[model samples]
Target: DELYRQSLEIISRYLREQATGAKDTKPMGRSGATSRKALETLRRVGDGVQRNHETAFQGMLRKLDIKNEDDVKSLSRVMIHVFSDGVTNWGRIVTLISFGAFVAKHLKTINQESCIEPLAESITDVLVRTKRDWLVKQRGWDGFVEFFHVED
Candidate 1:
Protein backbone atom coordinates (compact mmCIF):
# COMPACT_ATOMS: atom_id res chain seq x y z
CA ASP A 1 0.00 0.00 0.00
CA GLU A 2 2.78 2.37 0.83
CA LEU A 3 4.58 1.56 -2.36
CA TYR A 4 1.42 2.06 -4.37
CA ARG A 5 0.84 5.40 -2.67
CA GLN A 6 4.38 6.42 -3.40
CA SER A 7 4.04 5.31 -7.00
CA LEU A 8 0.92 7.37 -7.54
CA GLU A 9 2.55 10.39 -5.92
CA ILE A 10 5.59 10.00 -8.14
CA ILE A 11 3.50 9.76 -11.31
CA SER A 12 1.38 12.75 -10.35
CA ARG A 13 4.50 14.78 -9.65
CA TYR A 14 6.13 13.69 -12.87
CA LEU A 15 3.08 14.59 -14.97
CA ARG A 16 2.94 17.98 -13.33
CA GLU A 17 6.61 18.57 -14.01
CA GLN A 18 6.29 17.53 -17.64
CA ALA A 19 3.18 19.59 -18.30
CA THR A 20 4.37 22.76 -16.53
CA GLY A 21 8.18 22.45 -16.87
CA ALA A 22 8.72 22.91 -13.19
CA LYS A 23 11.24 20.96 -11.15
CA ASP A 24 9.00 20.76 -8.15
CA THR A 25 5.82 22.47 -7.07
CA LYS A 26 7.62 24.00 -4.08
CA PRO A 27 10.87 22.23 -3.15
CA MET A 28 12.18 18.70 -3.34
CA GLY A 29 14.89 16.70 -1.67
CA ARG A 30 16.58 13.70 -3.22
CA SER A 31 16.02 10.43 -1.42
CA GLY A 32 16.55 6.80 -2.28
CA ALA A 33 12.93 5.68 -1.96
CA THR A 34 11.49 8.62 -3.86
CA SER A 35 13.93 8.05 -6.71
CA ARG A 36 13.23 4.32 -6.90
CA LYS A 37 9.51 4.84 -6.63
CA ALA A 38 9.56 7.47 -9.34
CA LEU A 39 11.45 5.17 -11.70
CA GLU A 40 8.84 2.46 -11.23
CA THR A 41 5.94 4.84 -11.62
CA LEU A 42 7.48 6.22 -14.80
CA ARG A 43 7.54 2.72 -16.28
CA ARG A 44 3.83 2.27 -15.72
CA VAL A 45 2.97 5.76 -16.90
CA GLY A 46 5.07 5.33 -20.03
CA ASP A 47 3.44 2.02 -20.93
CA GLY A 48 -0.02 3.53 -20.47
CA VAL A 49 0.86 6.61 -22.50
CA GLN A 50 2.29 4.54 -25.35
CA ARG A 51 -0.80 2.36 -25.54
CA ASN A 52 -3.10 5.37 -25.48
CA HIS A 53 -1.08 7.15 -28.16
CA GLU A 54 -0.99 4.11 -30.43
CA THR A 55 -4.71 3.50 -30.12
CA ALA A 56 -5.58 7.15 -30.73
CA PHE A 57 -3.19 7.38 -33.66
CA GLN A 58 -4.63 4.28 -35.29
CA GLY A 59 -8.22 5.43 -34.84
CA MET A 60 -7.54 8.97 -36.00
CA LEU A 61 -5.64 7.70 -39.03
CA ARG A 62 -8.59 5.58 -40.10
CA LYS A 63 -11.09 8.36 -39.39
CA LEU A 64 -9.10 11.02 -41.23
CA ASP A 65 -8.02 8.65 -44.02
CA ILE A 66 -4.36 9.48 -43.49
CA LYS A 67 -2.60 7.16 -45.92
CA ASN A 68 1.12 7.74 -45.65
CA GLU A 69 3.98 8.99 -43.55
CA ASP A 70 4.30 11.95 -45.93
CA ASP A 71 0.76 12.95 -45.12
CA VAL A 72 1.56 12.74 -41.43
CA LYS A 73 4.85 14.61 -41.72
CA SER A 74 3.39 17.36 -43.93
CA LEU A 75 0.52 17.94 -41.57
CA SER A 76 2.99 17.94 -38.69
CA ARG A 77 5.07 20.62 -40.38
CA VAL A 78 2.03 22.76 -41.01
CA MET A 79 0.93 22.34 -37.43
CA ILE A 80 4.38 23.30 -36.21
CA HIS A 81 4.32 26.42 -38.35
CA VAL A 82 0.85 27.34 -37.14
CA PHE A 83 2.06 26.90 -33.56
CA SER A 84 5.45 28.57 -34.02
CA ASP A 85 3.78 31.65 -35.42
CA GLY A 86 1.34 31.82 -32.56
CA VAL A 87 -0.69 35.02 -32.80
CA THR A 88 1.97 36.36 -35.17
CA ASN A 89 -0.02 36.46 -38.40
CA TRP A 90 -2.50 39.31 -38.71
CA GLY A 91 -5.00 37.22 -40.64
CA ARG A 92 -4.86 34.36 -38.15
CA ILE A 93 -5.29 36.73 -35.22
CA VAL A 94 -8.27 38.50 -36.75
CA THR A 95 -9.87 35.24 -37.75
CA LEU A 96 -9.51 33.96 -34.21
CA ILE A 97 -10.91 37.10 -32.60
CA SER A 98 -13.65 37.84 -35.13
CA PHE A 99 -14.45 35.08 -37.58
CA GLY A 100 -13.73 32.28 -35.12
CA ALA A 101 -16.26 33.62 -32.67
CA PHE A 102 -18.91 34.08 -35.35
CA VAL A 103 -18.29 30.58 -36.59
CA ALA A 104 -18.30 29.16 -33.09
CA LYS A 105 -21.69 30.74 -32.51
CA HIS A 106 -23.09 29.28 -35.74
CA LEU A 107 -21.26 25.98 -36.21
CA LYS A 108 -20.94 22.97 -33.95
CA THR A 109 -18.99 20.51 -36.11
CA ILE A 110 -16.56 23.22 -37.08
CA ASN A 111 -15.81 23.81 -33.42
CA GLN A 112 -15.37 20.08 -32.82
CA GLU A 113 -13.92 18.51 -35.97
CA SER A 114 -11.82 21.51 -36.94
CA CYS A 115 -9.82 21.45 -33.71
CA ILE A 116 -9.93 17.88 -32.43
CA GLU A 117 -8.13 15.90 -35.13
CA PRO A 118 -5.32 18.33 -35.80
CA LEU A 119 -4.80 19.14 -32.16
CA ALA A 120 -4.68 15.46 -31.18
CA GLU A 121 -2.33 14.56 -33.99
CA SER A 122 -0.01 17.46 -33.25
CA ILE A 123 0.17 16.65 -29.57
CA THR A 124 0.55 12.92 -30.28
CA ASP A 125 3.45 13.53 -32.65
CA VAL A 126 5.30 15.57 -30.08
CA LEU A 127 4.62 13.06 -27.36
CA VAL A 128 5.61 10.09 -29.50
CA ARG A 129 8.85 11.79 -30.50
CA THR A 130 9.64 12.71 -26.94
CA LYS A 131 8.68 9.28 -25.69
CA ARG A 132 10.93 7.62 -28.23
CA ASP A 133 13.87 9.65 -26.98
CA TRP A 134 12.93 8.91 -23.41
CA LEU A 135 13.01 5.21 -24.20
CA VAL A 136 16.38 5.52 -25.93
CA LYS A 137 17.98 7.38 -23.04
CA GLN A 138 16.87 8.02 -19.53
CA ARG A 139 18.06 11.53 -18.85
CA GLY A 140 18.12 13.28 -15.56
CA TRP A 141 17.62 16.95 -14.74
CA ASP A 142 20.73 18.15 -16.60
CA GLY A 143 19.82 16.29 -19.79
CA PHE A 144 18.13 19.21 -21.54
CA VAL A 145 21.07 21.50 -20.86
CA GLU A 146 23.44 18.91 -22.28
CA PHE A 147 21.10 18.26 -25.22
CA PHE A 148 20.86 21.96 -26.09
CA HIS A 149 24.64 22.09 -26.31
CA VAL A 150 24.79 18.98 -28.48
CA GLU A 151 25.58 19.73 -32.13
CA ASP A 152 24.54 17.62 -35.04
Candidate 2:
Protein backbone atom coordinates (compact mmCIF):
# COMPACT_ATOMS: atom_id res chain seq x y z
CA ASP A 1 0.00 0.00 0.00
CA GLU A 2 2.80 2.40 0.84
CA LEU A 3 4.66 1.63 -2.38
CA TYR A 4 1.49 2.02 -4.44
CA ARG A 5 0.77 5.37 -2.84
CA GLN A 6 4.30 6.52 -3.56
CA SER A 7 3.97 5.59 -7.20
CA LEU A 8 0.58 7.30 -7.36
CA GLU A 9 2.02 10.49 -5.93
CA ILE A 10 4.75 10.58 -8.58
CA ILE A 11 2.37 9.83 -11.45
CA SER A 12 -0.03 12.43 -10.09
CA ARG A 13 2.64 15.11 -10.57
CA TYR A 14 2.73 14.31 -14.25
CA LEU A 15 -1.05 14.40 -14.36
CA ARG A 16 -1.04 17.80 -12.65
CA GLU A 17 1.49 19.10 -15.17
CA GLN A 18 -0.70 17.84 -17.98
CA ALA A 19 -3.76 19.55 -16.44
CA THR A 20 -2.00 22.88 -16.24
CA GLY A 21 -2.49 23.45 -19.97
CA ALA A 22 -5.91 21.91 -20.40
CA LYS A 23 -8.45 23.73 -22.56
CA ASP A 24 -11.80 23.56 -20.87
CA THR A 25 -14.94 23.68 -22.96
CA LYS A 26 -17.39 23.28 -20.06
CA PRO A 27 -17.67 23.51 -16.32
CA MET A 28 -16.51 20.40 -14.40
CA GLY A 29 -17.99 21.20 -10.97
CA ARG A 30 -17.15 19.45 -7.69
CA SER A 31 -15.74 16.24 -9.07
CA GLY A 32 -13.09 18.27 -10.85
CA ALA A 33 -12.12 20.02 -7.65
CA THR A 34 -12.15 16.81 -5.65
CA SER A 35 -10.00 14.90 -8.08
CA ARG A 36 -7.54 17.77 -8.34
CA LYS A 37 -7.41 17.99 -4.57
CA ALA A 38 -6.59 14.31 -4.40
CA LEU A 39 -3.64 14.86 -6.70
CA GLU A 40 -2.59 18.02 -4.90
CA THR A 41 -2.62 16.27 -1.55
CA LEU A 42 -0.34 13.63 -2.95
CA ARG A 43 1.89 16.34 -4.40
CA ARG A 44 2.37 17.86 -0.98
CA VAL A 45 3.92 14.66 0.33
CA GLY A 46 7.55 15.69 0.20
CA ASP A 47 9.09 14.14 3.27
CA GLY A 48 7.89 10.59 2.76
CA VAL A 49 5.16 8.86 0.78
CA GLN A 50 4.12 6.67 3.70
CA ARG A 51 3.61 9.55 6.07
CA ASN A 52 1.79 11.55 3.42
CA HIS A 53 -0.30 8.62 2.41
CA GLU A 54 -1.27 7.89 6.00
CA THR A 55 -2.03 11.50 6.72
CA ALA A 56 -3.73 12.77 3.58
CA PHE A 57 -4.95 9.85 1.49
CA GLN A 58 -5.91 7.91 4.60
CA GLY A 59 -7.87 10.90 5.77
CA MET A 60 -9.70 10.86 2.47
CA LEU A 61 -10.56 7.23 2.94
CA ARG A 62 -11.89 7.92 6.41
CA LYS A 63 -13.79 11.02 5.35
CA LEU A 64 -15.45 9.11 2.55
CA ASP A 65 -16.11 6.08 4.78
CA ILE A 66 -14.41 3.74 2.36
CA LYS A 67 -14.05 0.61 4.48
CA ASN A 68 -14.67 -2.17 2.00
CA GLU A 69 -14.59 -3.26 -1.63
CA ASP A 70 -17.97 -1.72 -2.48
CA ASP A 71 -16.91 1.65 -1.20
CA VAL A 72 -13.82 1.52 -3.41
CA LYS A 73 -15.94 0.66 -6.42
CA SER A 74 -18.24 3.55 -5.65
CA LEU A 75 -15.25 5.84 -5.51
CA SER A 76 -14.05 4.66 -8.91
CA ARG A 77 -17.51 5.12 -10.37
CA VAL A 78 -17.54 8.70 -9.19
CA MET A 79 -14.13 9.25 -10.73
CA ILE A 80 -15.31 7.68 -13.95
CA HIS A 81 -18.25 10.03 -14.09
CA VAL A 82 -15.99 13.00 -13.63
CA PHE A 83 -13.54 11.72 -16.20
CA SER A 84 -16.44 11.18 -18.58
CA ASP A 85 -17.39 14.83 -18.38
CA GLY A 86 -13.86 15.89 -19.28
CA VAL A 87 -13.08 12.98 -21.54
CA THR A 88 -11.88 15.27 -24.32
CA ASN A 89 -8.97 16.42 -22.20
CA TRP A 90 -5.97 14.17 -21.82
CA GLY A 91 -5.33 15.45 -18.32
CA ARG A 92 -8.59 14.14 -16.95
CA ILE A 93 -7.92 10.78 -18.57
CA VAL A 94 -4.53 10.67 -16.96
CA THR A 95 -6.03 11.62 -13.61
CA LEU A 96 -8.66 8.94 -13.93
CA ILE A 97 -6.07 6.30 -14.75
CA SER A 98 -3.83 7.36 -11.90
CA PHE A 99 -6.63 7.57 -9.37
CA GLY A 100 -8.13 4.31 -10.52
CA ALA A 101 -4.77 2.62 -10.12
CA PHE A 102 -4.60 3.78 -6.53
CA VAL A 103 -8.07 2.48 -5.75
CA ALA A 104 -7.30 -0.82 -7.45
CA LYS A 105 -4.17 -1.27 -5.41
CA HIS A 106 -6.05 -0.59 -2.21
CA LEU A 107 -8.68 -3.10 -3.17
CA LYS A 108 -6.02 -5.66 -3.98
CA THR A 109 -4.47 -5.24 -0.56
CA ILE A 110 -7.79 -5.99 1.09
CA ASN A 111 -8.35 -9.19 -0.93
CA GLN A 112 -10.91 -7.71 -3.26
CA GLU A 113 -10.79 -8.51 -6.97
CA SER A 114 -10.53 -4.80 -7.84
CA CYS A 115 -12.54 -2.89 -10.40
CA ILE A 116 -9.82 -1.11 -12.34
CA GLU A 117 -11.01 -2.94 -15.42
CA PRO A 118 -14.50 -1.58 -14.88
CA LEU A 119 -13.18 1.92 -14.61
CA ALA A 120 -11.09 1.59 -17.76
CA GLU A 121 -14.01 0.06 -19.61
CA SER A 122 -16.21 2.98 -18.66
CA ILE A 123 -13.65 5.50 -19.86
CA THR A 124 -13.07 3.63 -23.08
CA ASP A 125 -16.78 3.44 -23.80
CA VAL A 126 -17.19 7.18 -23.48
CA LEU A 127 -14.02 8.04 -25.38
CA VAL A 128 -14.87 5.77 -28.28
CA ARG A 129 -18.42 6.99 -28.57
CA THR A 130 -18.19 10.72 -27.84
CA LYS A 131 -14.61 11.86 -28.20
CA ARG A 132 -13.53 9.96 -31.28
CA ASP A 133 -13.53 13.02 -33.51
CA TRP A 134 -11.78 15.23 -30.98
CA LEU A 135 -9.28 12.48 -30.30
CA VAL A 136 -8.54 11.91 -33.98
CA LYS A 137 -8.50 15.54 -35.04
CA GLN A 138 -6.78 17.10 -32.05
CA ARG A 139 -4.83 14.21 -30.59
CA GLY A 140 -4.43 11.84 -33.58
CA TRP A 141 -3.39 8.19 -33.84
CA ASP A 142 -0.56 8.58 -31.41
CA GLY A 143 -3.03 9.74 -28.77
CA PHE A 144 -5.04 6.60 -29.22
CA VAL A 145 -1.88 4.53 -28.95
CA GLU A 146 -0.90 6.40 -25.84
CA PHE A 147 -4.20 5.90 -24.05
CA PHE A 148 -5.31 2.50 -25.28
CA HIS A 149 -1.90 1.07 -26.10
CA VAL A 150 -2.98 -0.44 -29.41
CA GLU A 151 -0.15 -1.13 -31.87
CA ASP A 152 -2.17 -1.03 -35.07
Candidate 3:
Protein backbone atom coordinates (compact mmCIF):
# COMPACT_ATOMS: atom_id res chain seq x y z
CA ASP A 1 0.00 0.00 0.00
CA GLU A 2 2.96 2.29 0.60
CA LEU A 3 4.03 2.01 -2.99
CA TYR A 4 0.58 2.74 -4.28
CA ARG A 5 0.19 5.54 -1.78
CA GLN A 6 3.43 7.14 -2.82
CA SER A 7 2.65 6.70 -6.50
CA LEU A 8 -0.67 8.38 -6.02
CA GLU A 9 1.03 11.14 -4.12
CA ILE A 10 3.39 11.91 -6.96
CA ILE A 11 0.65 11.69 -9.54
CA SER A 12 -1.58 13.89 -7.40
CA ARG A 13 1.12 16.50 -7.15
CA TYR A 14 1.50 16.62 -10.89
CA LEU A 15 -2.25 16.72 -11.37
CA ARG A 16 -2.85 19.51 -8.86
CA GLU A 17 -0.12 21.50 -10.56
CA GLN A 18 -1.75 20.98 -13.89
CA ALA A 19 -5.06 22.10 -12.50
CA THR A 20 -3.49 25.35 -11.41
CA GLY A 21 -2.06 25.94 -14.90
CA ALA A 22 1.44 24.99 -13.89
CA LYS A 23 3.82 24.32 -16.74
CA ASP A 24 3.76 20.77 -17.97
CA THR A 25 6.47 18.88 -16.09
CA LYS A 26 5.70 15.66 -17.95
CA PRO A 27 3.68 14.81 -21.05
CA MET A 28 0.49 14.32 -19.06
CA GLY A 29 -1.45 16.84 -21.20
CA ARG A 30 -4.35 18.97 -19.95
CA SER A 31 -5.78 18.70 -16.45
CA GLY A 32 -9.42 19.09 -15.46
CA ALA A 33 -12.14 17.93 -13.04
CA THR A 34 -12.09 14.40 -14.36
CA SER A 35 -8.49 13.89 -13.43
CA ARG A 36 -9.27 15.26 -10.01
CA LYS A 37 -12.15 12.86 -9.45
CA ALA A 38 -10.11 9.96 -10.77
CA LEU A 39 -7.42 10.81 -8.29
CA GLU A 40 -10.02 10.55 -5.57
CA THR A 41 -11.07 7.12 -6.80
CA LEU A 42 -7.48 5.96 -6.79
CA ARG A 43 -7.13 7.07 -3.21
CA ARG A 44 -10.33 5.29 -2.23
CA VAL A 45 -9.00 2.08 -3.69
CA GLY A 46 -5.80 2.58 -1.77
CA ASP A 47 -7.90 2.81 1.36
CA GLY A 48 -9.94 -0.17 0.24
CA VAL A 49 -6.88 -2.40 0.13
CA GLN A 50 -5.68 -1.58 3.59
CA ARG A 51 -7.42 -4.38 5.41
CA ASN A 52 -6.19 -7.76 4.16
CA HIS A 53 -3.79 -7.32 1.30
CA GLU A 54 -1.44 -4.71 2.65
CA THR A 55 1.25 -7.16 3.72
CA ALA A 56 0.87 -9.30 0.64
CA PHE A 57 1.02 -6.29 -1.62
CA GLN A 58 4.17 -5.13 0.06
CA GLY A 59 5.74 -8.55 -0.20
CA MET A 60 4.82 -8.72 -3.85
CA LEU A 61 6.57 -5.46 -4.48
CA ARG A 62 9.67 -6.66 -2.65
CA LYS A 63 9.70 -9.96 -4.52
CA LEU A 64 9.41 -8.13 -7.80
CA ASP A 65 12.58 -6.14 -6.98
CA ILE A 66 11.54 -3.06 -8.90
CA LYS A 67 12.67 0.48 -8.40
CA ASN A 68 9.62 1.37 -6.42
CA GLU A 69 9.61 5.07 -7.18
CA ASP A 70 10.02 4.61 -10.90
CA ASP A 71 7.41 1.92 -11.10
CA VAL A 72 5.04 4.07 -9.09
CA LYS A 73 5.42 6.95 -11.53
CA SER A 74 5.04 4.66 -14.51
CA LEU A 75 1.91 3.14 -13.09
CA SER A 76 0.73 6.57 -12.05
CA ARG A 77 1.03 7.79 -15.61
CA VAL A 78 -1.33 5.09 -16.84
CA MET A 79 -3.63 5.69 -13.91
CA ILE A 80 -3.82 9.32 -14.91
CA HIS A 81 -4.78 8.35 -18.40
CA VAL A 82 -7.41 5.88 -17.29
CA PHE A 83 -8.87 8.09 -14.58
CA SER A 84 -8.90 11.16 -16.74
CA ASP A 85 -10.56 9.25 -19.56
CA GLY A 86 -13.23 7.91 -17.23
CA VAL A 87 -14.06 11.33 -15.85
CA THR A 88 -13.93 12.94 -19.28
CA ASN A 89 -16.81 10.70 -20.27
CA TRP A 90 -18.90 12.47 -17.66
CA GLY A 91 -18.30 10.22 -14.65
CA ARG A 92 -18.46 6.99 -16.59
CA ILE A 93 -17.40 4.26 -14.18
CA VAL A 94 -16.24 2.00 -16.99
CA THR A 95 -13.03 3.97 -17.35
CA LEU A 96 -12.45 3.44 -13.68
CA ILE A 97 -13.02 -0.27 -14.11
CA SER A 98 -10.14 -0.49 -16.53
CA PHE A 99 -7.65 0.22 -13.74
CA GLY A 100 -7.03 -3.40 -12.82
CA ALA A 101 -5.95 -4.23 -16.33
CA PHE A 102 -3.73 -1.20 -16.33
CA VAL A 103 -2.09 -2.39 -13.14
CA ALA A 104 -1.55 -5.86 -14.54
CA LYS A 105 -0.06 -4.53 -17.75
CA HIS A 106 2.65 -2.52 -16.06
CA LEU A 107 3.43 -5.27 -13.58
CA LYS A 108 3.71 -7.70 -16.48
CA THR A 109 6.06 -5.35 -18.27
CA ILE A 110 8.41 -5.53 -15.31
CA ASN A 111 8.22 -9.34 -15.35
CA GLN A 112 6.56 -9.58 -11.96
CA GLU A 113 4.39 -12.58 -12.64
CA SER A 114 4.80 -14.50 -9.42
CA CYS A 115 2.06 -12.46 -7.87
CA ILE A 116 0.64 -10.45 -10.77
CA GLU A 117 -0.92 -13.34 -12.65
CA PRO A 118 -3.27 -13.89 -9.78
CA LEU A 119 -3.78 -10.18 -9.39
CA ALA A 120 -4.85 -9.97 -13.00
CA GLU A 121 -7.18 -12.90 -12.54
CA SER A 122 -8.75 -11.34 -9.49
CA ILE A 123 -9.40 -8.06 -11.26
CA THR A 124 -10.79 -9.94 -14.24
CA ASP A 125 -13.46 -11.22 -11.93
CA VAL A 126 -14.41 -7.71 -10.90
CA LEU A 127 -14.18 -6.39 -14.42
CA VAL A 128 -16.39 -9.08 -15.89
CA ARG A 129 -18.94 -8.80 -13.12
CA THR A 130 -19.09 -5.03 -13.44
CA LYS A 131 -18.86 -4.85 -17.20
CA ARG A 132 -22.52 -4.17 -17.74
CA ASP A 133 -23.03 -1.72 -14.93
CA TRP A 134 -20.67 0.98 -16.12
CA LEU A 135 -22.14 4.46 -16.24
CA VAL A 136 -21.15 4.67 -19.90
CA LYS A 137 -21.53 1.13 -21.13
CA GLN A 138 -20.46 1.57 -24.72
CA ARG A 139 -16.99 2.73 -23.83
CA GLY A 140 -16.43 -0.08 -21.36
CA TRP A 141 -15.53 -2.78 -23.84
CA ASP A 142 -13.59 -0.45 -26.08
CA GLY A 143 -11.70 1.05 -23.18
CA PHE A 144 -11.11 -2.35 -21.66
CA VAL A 145 -9.60 -3.76 -24.80
CA GLU A 146 -7.69 -0.63 -25.55
CA PHE A 147 -6.07 -0.32 -22.14
CA PHE A 148 -6.07 -3.92 -21.08
CA HIS A 149 -4.50 -6.59 -23.27
CA VAL A 150 -6.37 -9.80 -22.72
CA GLU A 151 -4.41 -12.88 -21.76
CA ASP A 152 -5.71 -16.06 -23.28
Model 2: per-residue lDDT, tens digit, 25-138?
A: 343333444334434443333213434354554555456665564564466555445556633565444444444444445555555543434443444454455555675574
Question: Taking the tens digit of each residue's C-alpha lDDT, what string does model 3 give over 92-125?
Answer: 3332333333344345455543434344333333
Whole-model alpha-carbon lDDT for candidate 1? 0.36
Question: Can you tell me which runs of candidate 1 are displaced by over 4 Å?
Answer: 25-152
lDDT of each: 0.36, 0.43, 0.38
TM-score of 2: 0.42
Clashing pairs in 3: none
Which candidate, 1 or 3, would have the higher TM-score against the true structure? 3
lDDT (Cα) of model 2? 0.43
On lDDT, the leading prediction is: 2
Candidate numbers, best TM-score first, in rank order:
2, 3, 1
Name the better of 1 and 2 by TM-score: 2
Candidate 2 clashing pairs? none
Q: Tens digit of lDDT per residue, candidate 1, span 1-152?
A: 23223323443344333333344635334443444444343434443444445555344444544333344445555434544453333222222122212222222222232332333344345333433344236343233223323232
Clashes of each: 0, 0, 0
Q: By descending lDDT, how would the candidates be arranged?
A: 2, 3, 1
lDDT-better candidate, 1 vs 3: 3
Overlapping backbone residue pairs in candidate 2 total 0
